[PDB]
């Protein structure tokens, strides 16, 4: 189903500074995971000031079962 907030935030921590305005890789190898990006309109925000709810966009990724 939908990746949890816990999952997405864990993933944001794992990708650290590779987070960018481009969609990340899928967070998983099998099943459903998340991809994340810095919202286009937030590209000028210092990384340390990015807000999970308002500056990070999310999309589900569906890998093979």
């Amino acid at each position, epitope marked *: 189903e939908e990746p949890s907030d816990k999952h997405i935030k864990e993933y944001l921590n794992k990708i650290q500074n590779s987070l960018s305005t481009e969609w990340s890789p899928c967070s998983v190898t099998c099943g459903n995971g998340i*991809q994340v990006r810095i919202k286009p309109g937030s590209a000028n925000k210092p990384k340390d000031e990015l807000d999970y709810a308002n500056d990070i966009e999310k999309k589900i990724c569906k890998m093979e079962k």
Partner: antibody
Amino acid sequence: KVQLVQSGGGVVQPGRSQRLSCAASGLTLSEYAMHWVRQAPGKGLEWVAVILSDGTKKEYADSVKGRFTISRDNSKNTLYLQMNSLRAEDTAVYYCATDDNILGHCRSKSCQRNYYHGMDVWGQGTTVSVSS
Amino acid sequence: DIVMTQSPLSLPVTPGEPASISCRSSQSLLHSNGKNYLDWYLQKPGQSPQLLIYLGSDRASGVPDRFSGSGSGTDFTLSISRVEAEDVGVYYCMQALQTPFTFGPGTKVDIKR
């Protein structure tokens, strides 16, 4: 670059069929729900159909239901529109466009958060002219 | 189906002056998740449509600052702080709340001389 490359279309007689293609390059089609949108000559935009990233939950505008069907082949990074029983009303430029909301959350079922960020990538358009 | 209306339908803009386009929906586009499912697209002459604004107020990638979207529920506005020659074309709002997605009729912008 990131591109949707459309092909197909051209002149087709009323009642005949045409199949449109929309091939992605620079992006992975399986990461998108995909839409068709069309524009009759001199008129506005009209939404035609959508298909989720895994091919499920195909949906159609009332104006085409029963005659058009949407399909995709993620392994070929390509989206299709099959158009049967074409009418003069169907003459238009047809566009494909992307949607990050791969599985229809929020708009079709409950969601914990939004996944839609507009239809950001558009093909160059395919002209379909329905005429005898 | 949700019905979308726009005003004005024709919008000439003197160079240097701002412009504003109104969009109304027949049903609220505010979702329980807090987002307003309203997009704005521009179609320049002979070109495919391109995304300007999504979710009411978010700028798409590559969209200049002069474009901004505002509003909520059934009442939305596209504001263009200035209209360059490259901004001429037809502006459409579109609701993305539920299928069928539906578009406004279009507002045609040109340079006022």
